[PDB]
Amino acid sequence: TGPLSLRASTHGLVINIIHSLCTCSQLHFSEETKQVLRLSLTEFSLPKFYLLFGISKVKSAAVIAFRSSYERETFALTSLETVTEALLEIMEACMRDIPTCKWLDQWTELAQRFAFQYNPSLQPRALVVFGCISKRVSHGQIKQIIRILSKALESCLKGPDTYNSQVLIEATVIALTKLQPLLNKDSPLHKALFWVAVAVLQLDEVNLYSAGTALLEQNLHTLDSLRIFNDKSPEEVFMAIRNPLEWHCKQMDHFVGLNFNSNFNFALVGHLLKGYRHPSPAIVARTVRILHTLLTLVNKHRNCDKFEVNTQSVAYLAALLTVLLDEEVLTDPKIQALLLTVLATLVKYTTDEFDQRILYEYLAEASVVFPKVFPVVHNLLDSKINTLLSLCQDPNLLNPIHGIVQSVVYHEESPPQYQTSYLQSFGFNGLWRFAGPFSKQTQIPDYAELIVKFLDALIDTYLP
Amino acid sequence: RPVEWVQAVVSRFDEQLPIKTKVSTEHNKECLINISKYKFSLVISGLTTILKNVNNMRIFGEAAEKNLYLSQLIILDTLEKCLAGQPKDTMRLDETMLVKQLLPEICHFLHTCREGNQHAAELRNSASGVLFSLSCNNFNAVFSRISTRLQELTVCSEDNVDVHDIELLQY
C-alpha cells in the first residue's frame, strides 16, 4: 500500500526483522532454528517475493528505500496468503524452542478483533490473516463469516460501486477455505459449504471463480479424508443436505437453467465447464483435478474402475476427453442428448486445432449412433461449422465436418422426433450460456437475492 | 438449418470457377456427390444455375477462354458423376421443368455445331455423356422436344434447327 518508497521500506523492514531475529544472543535459539531462519532470509531475498511485495523492476530495495535522499499495480489476496504463510512458518520455527511464548495467541486476538468488525480498508486483509493463522474455529465464528458474506452480497446488490464488496466476498471464501479443515467432523457444515462454493461459481467473477474452485478442491479433499464417500455417492449426501432448503435452490436452478434435481453430475459439469475459459492456467489445472477426483469417487462408488463408461460417469469422461460412445450403455435419450450438448458447447467456444479436431471426430460418430436426437445440438454448431465449411482449407478438419453434414442430410426424414427446445422440457437449459467466456462487465447477476436467502436458510437450519 | 449448410457447400465449390487449395475443393466435390446421392434435386438446380451463369457470363482474354474451358470441363464432369451416382434406388422421376431448365445450354453450346472443337471436343464428349446419363432417366421430355421441333419444320426451307435439334437424337 502506498508509493514505491513505502513498499520498499516495508520490504527492508521484513528483512531487518528476520536479520535481527537470527543475529542476537538474547533469544539463544537452537541451531536448526537458525538454519531455517537463514533459509527464510534467502527466500525473502528472491525476486518472487519482490513481486509478492509489489516491488517490481527494482534491483535493490535498499537503494530506493533512501532514493529521495540520493499505486498502479493492483493487489491480490493470494500474495498476502503466501506472505502470511511464510511469516507464520518463521514465527512457528522460533516459538518451538521458546517455552510459553504466547505470541500466537496475541496474533490471533489481533486478527480476530479486526476481522469481525466493519472496516472496508482493513477487514478483507484481516479475514485472510485470521484464516491463515488460526488453529481453532467454532460454529459461531464461521456463521459470522457467512453473515458477513450475505451482507456483502446485499451491499454489492444495492450499491453501484461493487469492487470493494467483491474483494470482501473473495476474502470471505478463502477464509472459509483455510478454516474448514480445523472444524470438527460432526458439523454438517463440512458438506453444506460445498453448495456455498457452487453459489460463488454462479457469480461469474474471475477472482470469485478461482476462490470457489479452491474452496471446492479443499472441500473434496477434506471430505474424502473424513471418509463420508466410502458408502455413498457424491449425489446422495449433497442432495441429502440440500433436501430442506431446496425451494430457494429451485428458483436458483430455474434462473441458472441447470437442475441438480434431475441430473446431479451433468449439473456439476456444467458449472465446472467454465474453468477452461479462465485466463490463468492454474485454475484450469485445478478444474481438471476437480473432475478427476469426482470421477474416481463416482466410479469407486459403483465398484468399477477408472475410465469406465457408464450412465453417471459419462459427463466427466466427456469433459476430460478434451484433455467409447456406446448406445447400449446410454439408452435413455435425455442422457445422450446432454452428452451431445456438452460436446457442442466445447466445439462452439474453444478455438484450438487439436481439441476441435478430436471433438469433431467424436461428434461425427455420435451423428451415426444417435441421429434422432442429433437435431437438438444443431444450432449450437450451426454457425461455426458453416464458417469452417467456408474457410477451412485443412482436409483433416473438414473431413469429419463433411461426415456430419452427410449424416444429417441422410437423416432429415424425421425432424419432429426432437427439437432444439427439448432441453427446456426438463430443467437443463443455458448449459451453453453458462459455459460461455467470462464477461468484460463481470457484473453480479440478480437472483443474487435468491443466493442471499439461500445462505440465510443455511444459517437458520444448521447454526441453531 | 442444414439447407444453409448444403448451399454453403455448393457455393464453396463455386468460388473456384470465377477464378478458373486443390485438395480442399476435391474433398468438397466428393462431398457434393455424397449429398447428391441422398437429395439431388436442389443440387442439380444449383448446378444448372451456376453453369448457366458461367456460360452466360461474357469475358475476354486468352486466359479467359482457357478459364471458361477448364471451368466448364469441371462442371460437366462433376455433374456427370452426380447424375451417375443418383439412382441408389429406382428413383427415375425428376421434375420435367428441372430437366427443361438443364436442357437448353447442354443442347446448344456443344450441339448447335461443333463449337470450339480444338478445346471442346472432349467437352462435346462430356456433354454427350451427361445427356446419355440423363436420357437413361427422363428422356421423355427430350423425346417430346424432338417431336415438337419436327412439327416446327412446317413450311419454310430456311431452317437450320436440324443441326441444333435433330442431331441431339444421336446422343
From Swiss-Prot, chain A:
Detected in brain, peripheral nerve, lung, colon and muscle. It is found in: Nucleus; Nucleus, Nucleolus; Cell membrane. Transmembrane segments: none annotated. Stimulates the GTPase activity of Ras. NF1 shows greater affinity for Ras GAP, but lower specific activity. May be a regulator of Ras activity. This is Neurofibromin. Ubiquitinated by RNF7/RBX2, leading to its degradation. Binds phospholipids via its C-terminal CRAL-TRIO domain. Binds primarily glycerophospholipids with monounsaturated C18:1 and/or C16:1 fatty acid moieties and a phosphatidylethanolamine or phosphatidylcholine headgroup. Has lesser affinity for lipids containing phosphatidylserine and phosphatidylinositol. Interacts with HTR6. Interacts with SPRED2. It is linked to Neurofibromatosis 1: A disease characterized by patches of skin pigmentation (cafe-au-lait spots), Lisch nodules of the iris, tumors in the peripheral nervous system and fibromatous skin tumors. Individuals with the disorder have increased susceptibility to the development of benign and malignant tumors. Leukemia, juvenile myelomonocytic: An aggressive pediatric myelodysplastic syndrome/myeloproliferative disorder characterized by malignant transformation in the hematopoietic stem cell compartment with proliferation of differentiated progeny. Patients have splenomegaly, enlarged lymph nodes, rashes, and hemorrhages.
